[PDB]
Design a protein around this ligand. Structure first.
Ligand SMILES: *[C@@H]1O[C@H](CO)[C@@H](O[C@@H]2O[C@H](CO)[C@@H](O[C@@H]3O[C@H](CO)[C@@H](O)[C@H](O)[C@@H]3O)[C@H](O)[C@H]2NC(C)=O)[C@H](O)[C@H]1NC(C)=O
Ligand SMILES: *[C@@H]1O[C@H](CO)[C@@H](O[C@@H]2O[C@H](CO)[C@@H](O[C@@H]3O[C@H](CO)[C@@H](O)[C@H](O)[C@@H]3O)[C@H](O)[C@H]2NC(C)=O)[C@H](O)[C@H]1NC(C)=O
Ligand SMILES: *[C@@H]1O[C@H](CO)[C@@H](O)[C@H](O)[C@H]1NC(C)=O
Ligand SMILES: [Cl-]
Ligand SMILES: [Cl-]
Lengths: 636, 16
């Protein structure tokens, strides 16, 4: 360990300073498209008084991954941009930026500045309304925009915000579906807060020319992968139930899920083409609830995890899709003793379990036994309680296996200052990566992991690893230390450019600055076929025939070798071959009406929300797990 | 002052 020599030379010329405006202003960063290098930076000075009197927005634009910027404030004339709305960037490489300008007193509608050539040219456009929300793009067409007004009217544009037309008047919530469909709720007599529970859900397939009332007595709605969800109030009651439609609200079916009071809430934790994870808050503001995984129809729900930590009103939950490995999800749970623990599922919420203790760790003060304990992960709740946690867990799909996160090693989540931990196998095994809290980033699909220390002092050092966090080279990137604020790499983790943001120590003033580093010379050579190695995902018992079967299949990957030092590339694709396992009874979840004593699904004599689902239809008592792809073997 | 690098498509949890 410590392999590399003369790396300082290879990074010195590739480090790129850029000073911006002083700390009298506030910076806001936004990327525009993949493989572009196009970053926008909006400096904003505001001294807010009784009315608008002083304020200045400047706009900068890079196109070399943030190494150099050109001032483009002239392209928005001399206009103040409202940060609240932000930089509405279009999907894909559409190159469609839209800013929202402040307007004078008594103006009938607001103003926007909009480019569609990666911020090379903007054009001014006065609106017929004052917008309330940021302008949502349609995913199918980047020229199609919806926006909500300050008078609750839903406006739509076909020509990239050039001309707008009010499709409907009394709109609360609205969002795009597939094929340019617009689902939205609307009120009748009183406002959204008052009419909450007696709203009605509308649909338009043709940009508001035609309409269809797809639901009534609505609390709210949501889109989750293939499914359309709607919370619906029980008539002559304050309770509500979740209803589901797979055909854009033409036909509905009530979900096999409990009804909830007004104190409680449902939450779409995660959703794909296969299934949904649904949180249901336990009544009486207890601060937890219950995860339910759906079937492929989104209708029958198995109870996945009890006592799931989710704070009141929503907002805070530690539920984390580990994107670097299939079927893996980490979250936090409350104990009976009121201590928070971290559970991991490897089979999409079939079985949950504690995380394995890392090799290079002692068990902390929370642990009963000094030698035997588990890993616990800091995420959104830890951050909300103001613990010394600079980042939530990080994983990238293209960096297969890699999960980086802060944590504590014991019987529960500890208030003490955490170290950073890494798994290279999607969270089966763990290791202490770095000592004390850091900010972290994955570059080149795992080829380089980068880390900056979280410090009250200013800093001038960046730690990097070419062998997935086992060995760490330390690089001094500036002679003048900075108070670090954040990192910015290109989304997708395919770049080799990291931008270290912060502000200077106090001289005449303090000023915003970004040191951008390219690692292209550190990984001078591209990776050949010899650099990769065969890796079975989910391996427990290598000698076993069913080893690595999760949702009825295995996956053998071509992972990059740790010792190998090379660029994966931008064009890099995750090479994997699946092995289809034989079906067992474990590959089938129990259909409605059936359960497991012990493991075989057997009918039940029906209480609670089961009885309600039965009353308000035909089955052998088994159904295939959604996304389960086993063939042959057991079959009821 | 303030520093923000927001995500374009942040997967906010839908409530019902
Ligand atoms: C948990 O996270 C993983 C990884 O982010 C999710 O799996 C990914 O799901 C998406 C969409 O369901 C898949 O996207 C695919 O994109 C290609 C085009 O790039 C397209 O050809 C496919 O039709 C599909 O849209 C993607 O395959 C998949 N990623 C991996 C690495 O398997 C997963 O859905 C998340 N879990 C939940 C419950 O949402
Ligand atoms: C890190 O940032 C640098 C710039 O600071 C990026 O450099 C850019 O790299 C690509 C090569 O992949 C160049 O692409 C160009 O493509 C067009 C169309 O095929 C072609 O006409 C050009 O000859 C060229 O190949 C691009 O010019 C280059 N830009 C600059 C300003 O040098 C680099 O992509 C980033 N690294 C990674 C790994 O993302
Ligand atoms: C600036 O706004 C004026 C109208 O107030 C317009 O004539 C001009 O085209 C605008 N320029 C740009 C670059 O948007
Ligand atoms: Cl399985
Ligand atoms: Cl301040």
């Amino acid at each position: 360990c410590g392999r590399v020599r003369d790396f300082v030379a290879k990074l010195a010329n590739n480090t790129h300073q850029h000073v911006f405006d002083d700390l009298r202003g506030s910076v806001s960063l936004s990327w525009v498209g993949d493989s572009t290098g196009v970053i926008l930076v909006l400096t904003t000075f505001h001294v807010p008084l009784v009315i608008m009197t002083f304020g200045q927005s400047k706009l900068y634009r890079s196109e070399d991954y943030g190494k150099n910027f050109k001032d483009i404030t002239d392209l928005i004339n001399n206009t103040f941009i409202r940060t609240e709305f932000g930089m509405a960037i279009g999907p894909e490489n559409s190159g469609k930026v839209v800013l929202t300008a402040e307007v004078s007193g008594g103006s009938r509608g607001g103003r926007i500045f909009r480019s569609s050539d990666f911020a090379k040219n903007f054009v001014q456009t006065d609106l017929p309304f004052h917008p309330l929300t940021q302008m949502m793009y349609s995913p199918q067409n980047s020229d199609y925009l919806l926006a909500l007004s300050t008078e609750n009217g839903l406006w739509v544009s076909k020509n990239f915000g050039g001309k707008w037309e009010e499709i409907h008047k009394a709109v609360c919530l609205a969002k795009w579906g597939s094929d340019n469909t617009i689902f939205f709720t609307t009120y009748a007599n009183g406002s959204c807060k008052a009419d909450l529970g007696a709203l009605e859900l509308w649909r338009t397939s043709d940009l508001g020319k035609s309409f269809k009332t797809i639901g009534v007595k609505i609390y709210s709605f949501g889109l989750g992968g293939r499914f359309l969800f709607a919370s619906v109030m029980a008539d002559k009651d304050t309770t509500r139930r979740i209803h589901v439609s797979t055909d854009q609200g033409d036909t509905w079916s009530m979900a096999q899920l409990p009804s909830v009071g007004q104190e409680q809430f449902y939450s779409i934790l995660a959703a794909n083409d296969d299934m949904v994870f649904m949180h249901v808050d336990e009544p009486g503001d207890t601060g937890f609830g219950t995860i339910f995984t759906s079937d492929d129809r989104g209708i029958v729900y198995s109870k996945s995890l009890d006592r799931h930590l989710y704070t009141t009103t929503g907002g805070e939950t530690d539920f984390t899709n580990v994107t670097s490995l299939r079927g893996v999800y980490i979250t936090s749970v409350l104990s009976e003793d009121n201590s928070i623990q971290t559970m991991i599922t490897f089979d999409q919420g079939g079985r949950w379990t504690h995380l394995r203790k890392p090799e290079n760790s002692e068990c902390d003060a929370t642990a009963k036994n000094k030698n035997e304990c588990s890993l616990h992960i800091h995420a959104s709740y830890s951050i909300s309680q103001k613990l010394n946690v600079p980042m939530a867990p990080l994983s990238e799909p293209n960096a297969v296996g890699i999960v980086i996160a802060h944590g504590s090693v014991g019987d529960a989540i500890s208030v003490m200052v955490p170290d950073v931990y890494i798994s290279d196998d999607g969270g089966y095994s763990w290791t202490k990566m770095l000592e004390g809290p850091h900010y972290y980033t994955i570059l080149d699909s795992g080829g380089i992991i980068v880390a900056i220390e979280h410090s009250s002092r200013p800093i001038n050092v960046i730690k990097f690893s070419t062998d997935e966090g086992q060995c760490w080279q330390t690089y001094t990137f500036t002679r003048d230390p900075i108070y670090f604020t954040g990192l910015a790499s290109e989304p997708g983790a395919r770049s080799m450019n990291i931008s270290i943001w912060g502000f200077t120590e106090s001289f005449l003033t303090s000023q915003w600055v970004s040191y951008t580093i390219d690692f292209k010379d550190i990984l001078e050579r591209n990776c050949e076929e010899k650099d990769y190695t065969i890796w079975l995902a989910h391996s427990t018992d290598p000698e076993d025939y069913e080893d690595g079967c999760i949702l009825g299949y295995k996956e053998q990957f071509l992972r990059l070798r740790k010792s190998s030092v090379c660029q994966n590339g931008r064009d890099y694709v995750v090479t994997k071959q699946p092995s289809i396992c034989l079906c067992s009874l474990e590959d089938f979840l129990c259909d409605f009406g059936y359960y497991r004593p012990e493991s075989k699904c057997v009918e039940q004599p029906l209480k609670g929300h089961d009885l309600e689902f039965c009353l308000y239809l035909t089955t052998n008592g088994y159904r295939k797990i959604p996304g389960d792809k086993c063939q042959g073997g057991v079959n009821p | 002052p303030r520093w923000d690098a927001p995500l374009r498509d942040p997967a906010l949890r839908q409530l019902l």
